[PDB]
C-alpha cells in the first residue's frame, strides 16, 4: 500500500546568471557558489488518505514539530560592553532568534563580539557569529550572510551566550519549521477560474460541504537544509512529523484504554434512550488531533449520533464529544479501533516516506 506517492524536491538556488547578483555577492560576501544551507521546496502527492491526515501532517511540519532556535541566555547581552545605543537587546535578540538553523547538536553556544574601530557604520553579518562550545562545526548551521544589526562608528556590541533552544512553532513562531507553498485536491475537478463566471468561486467543481477528497498534493518549503544533505534532511523532517502525530495519538490512547478510574479527561455518560456520550478533554491540544480523531471516528462509525470537537482559542484545550447508540464498552472499543487506524496510517506514511525519498 502506497499512500504517499512520488515527491519532488527542489532547493532554492541563487542564479548567478544575473550580473547584479554575482557582483553584489562577490563584492561583499566573496560569494561565488550556492550557500551552505538552502531553502528547499518539497511537493508531495498522497492517495487514498483523508484530508484530515494530510492537513495534520502539514500543520505539524509547520509549527508543531519540535524545532531549534538560536537564542540569548539571560545576561548574555553585555550591557556594559555593548556601546552601540541603537542595537537594543530586543532588536538583536529578535534578529538572532529567526535565523533558520539546521542544528544536529544542541550544545553549540555562539558568541558575538564586534568592535567598530573605524568611522564607517559597520554592519554585523552572520559570519561575525563566533562559536565557542561543543564539537567544532565542520558545516555551518546557518548561512553566513544574515544581517544582524549594524554598528555606529566607535560603538561595540558584545553578546557572549547565544545557545540553541528547543521548542515548537506553536508557542513561539521562531520555532516554525516549514512554510506552505501548495495544497490542492487532485481528485476534485477544477473550473477555469480565469473566466469571469468562475472568478468568485474557489474553482473546485464540488462544494466543500459535500466534498470528501482522497487524493491530495501538499507542498511545503523548509527554510534551511544543508546543500549536500537535502534528501536526508527532508526525510528526517517527515519521519519526525509522523512520529510526533503517532506519539500524540498514543497519548490520547493512553487515557482511552482506561475506561475506569475517572481521570478528569474522560467522562462517560449513559443518557436517555440507552445512548452513550463520551467527552474527551486534552489541555494544549489543537485542531490537528481533534480533526484527525473526528474524521477517523466518523469513518469508523458512519451512523454515529454525533461526533464533534472544539478547540476554543481560550481554555487552550480540545473537547471531543462523541454520542453513539451503543454501550460504553462498545463505544470505547470502536473509538480504540479508530485510534489504531490513525496510528496505522501514519506508520504507513512514515514507511512510504522512507521508500520514496531515500
Amino acid at each position: 500500500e502506497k499512500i504517499f506517492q512520488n515527491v519532488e524536491i527542489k532547493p532554492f538556488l541563487i542564479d548567478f546568471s544575473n550580473l547584479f547578483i554575482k557582483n553584489a555577492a562577490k563584492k561583499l560576501f566573496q560569494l561565488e557558489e550556492q550557500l551552505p544551507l538552502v531553502p528547499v521546496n518539497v511537493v508531495m502527492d498522497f492517495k487514498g488518505i483523508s484530508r484530515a491526515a494530510v492537513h495534520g501532517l502539514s500543520r505539524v511540519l509547520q509549527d508543531e514539530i519540535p524545532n531549534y532556535m538560536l537564542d540569548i541566555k539571560p545576561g548574555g547581552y553585555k550591557i556594559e560592553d555593548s556601546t552601540d545605543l541603537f542595537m537594543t537587546e530586543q532588536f538583536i535578540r529578535n534578529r538572532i532568534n529567526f535565523i533558520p538553523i539546521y542544528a544536529k547538536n544542541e550544545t553549540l553556544v555562539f558568541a558575538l563580539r564586534s568592535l567598530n574601530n573605524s568611522c564607517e557604520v559597520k554592519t554585523i553579518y552572520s559570519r561575525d557569529l563566533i562559536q565557542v562550545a561543543g564539537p567544532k562545526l565542520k558545516y555551518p548551521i546557518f548561512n553566513p550572510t544574515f544581517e544582524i544589526g549594524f554598528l555606529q562608528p566607535g560603538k561595540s556590541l558584545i553578546i557572549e551566550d547565544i545557545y540553541i533552544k528547543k521548542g515548537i512553532g506553536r508557542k513561539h513562531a521562531a520555532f516554525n519549521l516549514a512554510v506552505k507553498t501548495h495544497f490542492s485536491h487532485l481528485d476534485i475537478e477544477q473550473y477555469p477560474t480565469d473566466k469571469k463566471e468562475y472568478m468568485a468561486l474557489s474553482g473546485y467543481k464540488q462544494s466543500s460541504m459535500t466534498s470528501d477528497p482522497r487524493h491530495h498534493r501538499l507542498g511545503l518549503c523548509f527554510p534551511a537544509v544543508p546543500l549536500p544533505h537535502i534528501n536526508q534532511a527532508v526525510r528526517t523532517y517527515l519521519k519526525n512529523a509522523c512520529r510526533i502525530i503517532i506519539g500524540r495519538i498514543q497519548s490520547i490512547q493512553k487515557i482511552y484504554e482506561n475506561f475506569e478510574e475517572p481521570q478528569p479527561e474522560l467522562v462517560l455518560f449513559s443518557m436517555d434512550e440507552e445512548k452513550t456520550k463520551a467527552i474527551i478533554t486534552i489541555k494544549d491540544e489543537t485542531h490537528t488531533i481533534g480533526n484527525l480523531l473526528k474524521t477517523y471516528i466518523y469513518e469508523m462509525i458512519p451512523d454515529i449520533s454525533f461526533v464533534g470537537y472544539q478547540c476554543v482559542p481560550h481554555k487552550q484545550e480540545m473537547v471531543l464529544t462523541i454520542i453513539h447508540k451503543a454501550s460504553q464498552e462498545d463505544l470505547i472499543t470502536l473509538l480504540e479501533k479508530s485510534i489504531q487506524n490513525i496510528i496505522q496510517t501514519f506508520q504507513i506514511l512514515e514507511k512510504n516516506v522512507d521508500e520514496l525519498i531515500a
Binding site: 541563487i14 534578529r95 557604520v121 554592519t123 553579518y125
Partner: protein, 80 residues
C-alpha cells in the same frame, strides 16, 4: 531598522538574500535612472524599475509576502 531576517507573514528567510539585494537593487537603480536626482527618483513619471527578475535570481519564490517585505522594508542605515 533593517530587512527582516524572515518574511513576517510566512517565515521564509529573506534575510539571507537581503544584504545581497540591497546592493544589487542599488546597482540596478543606477542603470535604470537618468538625469534625475536620488531624492527625485520616487517622483519620476518616466521611470519604471521592476525587481521581479532580480529577486527571482536571488532564489526567492513568487510569494507576495516575501517580495513585499523584501522590496519595501526601510533600512535605518540609509536614513540615519
Amino acid at each position: 531598522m533593517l530587512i527582516p531576517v524572515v518574511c513576517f507573514t510566512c517565515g521564509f528567510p529573506i534575510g539571507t538574500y537581503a544584504a545581497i539585494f540591497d546592493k544589487a537593487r542599488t546597482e540596478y537603480i543606477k542603470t535604470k535612472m537618468g538625469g534625475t536626482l536620488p531624492q527625485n527618483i520616487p517622483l519620476d513619471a518616466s521611470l519604471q524599475i521592476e525587481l521581479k527578475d532580480l529577486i527571482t535570481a536571488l532564489g526567492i519564490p513568487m510569494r507576495v509576502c516575501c517580495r513585499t517585505h523584501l522590496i519595501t522594508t526601510l533600512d535605518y542605515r540609509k536614513y540615519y
